[PDB]
Amino acid sequence: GEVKMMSLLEEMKGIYSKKGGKVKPFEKFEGELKEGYRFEYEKKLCEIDVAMFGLISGDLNPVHFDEDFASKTRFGGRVVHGMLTTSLVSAAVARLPGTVVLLEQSFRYTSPVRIGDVVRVEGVVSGVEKNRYTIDVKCYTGDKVVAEGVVKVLIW
Amino acid sequence: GEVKMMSLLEEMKGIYSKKGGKVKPFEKFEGELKEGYRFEYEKKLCEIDVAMFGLISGDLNPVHFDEDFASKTRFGGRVVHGMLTTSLVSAAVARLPGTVVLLEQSFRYTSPVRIGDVVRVEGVVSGVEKNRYTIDVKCYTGDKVVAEGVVKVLIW
């Protein structure tokens, strides 16, 4: 992995982008983390994201993949995996200043996310104990809440 | 993109497998879901899983990717994304009989996971209210708990 990883990542990035995936250059936020620090992160979730999430996890639930199957359900169409939506929260907190590790997450999924939706993560730091930061998080498509909850991160 | 999806998935499965990913064929579990129903699901997390998770989420945290950087943290090397580990829980519950959608998830990350680890998800249904099932979940590497929490699923 050392050189293997960044080489594999770069190789897969070129394929991923050509399949319609959005590349999010990785840049850390700045400022002083403390109660009330706010941040935001957004990404369009495309067919390739659903497919890749399915392969890496093994979650090939037809409700995310099969148009006629999903059309028959109460959702009336495919929906993105809920855990793909909230994967964006990992990306958002990873951009906080310092070295970031996830300790806790807790989400409720409130409305489905459709393929092609832009999901926006809004976080605000709510608690600080030593180097553990508690963060209130809501995920949106447009102005509609699609997930809500809390994460805790360790930041060195 | 109704019929582009299943073609995209099949094509990506080939690239994914060639890069070392484990293809986790999708088959449903069986039985009537009552309190005390227990299930397990496991998957080996490989370099390609970390890379793909990073691309789909945008989480390119150096702690998961950069050997030199990660080696200087207390982990002594790279660790996988916590949310990659618990993505396997989505895949586990997706296999429950019926049409499954995630309603809630809550996890604490207790010990890091590394490239090459087999993560085993153990679930037990702890409560049922109509078609909403509360499931206690622990993720393991061998005998060691790496994440623990609770999910709630809607099953039609």
CB atoms A21 and B55 under 8 Å: yes
CB atoms B6 and A115 under 8 Å: no
Does the domain at residues A1-156 carry the CATH identifier 3.10.129.10? yes
Provide, as residue numbers in chain A, all residues whose Cβ is less than 8 Å from the Cβ of B79: 101
Q: Edge-to-edge strand order for the sheet containing A100-109?
A: A38-44, A118-129, A132-141, A144-155, A100-109, B100-109, B144-155, B132-141, B118-129, B38-44
Closest-CA distance of chain A to residue B36, Å: 23
Among A53, A68, A109, select the one facing B56 at the smallest CB separation: A53
CB atoms B106 and A102 under 8 Å: no
Question: DSSP letters along A48-109, please?
Answer: HHHHHHHHHH----HHHH-HHHHHHSTTSS----HHHHHHHHHHHHHTSSS-EEEEEEEEEE
Other C-beta atoms lying within 10 Å of the C-beta of residue B153: 24
Interface membership of B81 toward A (CB under 8 Å): yes
Interface membership of A54 toward B (CB under 8 Å): yes
What do you get for the CA distance between the two ends of chain A, in Å? Answer: 24
Q: What was the resolution (in A) of this experimentally determined structure?
A: 1.2
Determined by which method? X-ray
- Say how far apart CA B73 and CA B70 lie, in whole Å: 5
Consecutive H or E run containing A118: strand A118-129
Interface membership of A71 toward B (CB under 8 Å): no
Consecutive H or E run containing A135: strand A132-141
Query: Which pair of structure tokens corresponds to residue A79?
Result: 């929906």
CB atoms B55 and A105 under 8 Å: no
Q: Which of B143, B146, B125, B122 is nearest to B134 (CA)?
A: B125
Q: Which residue has the tokens 């930061």?
A: A133
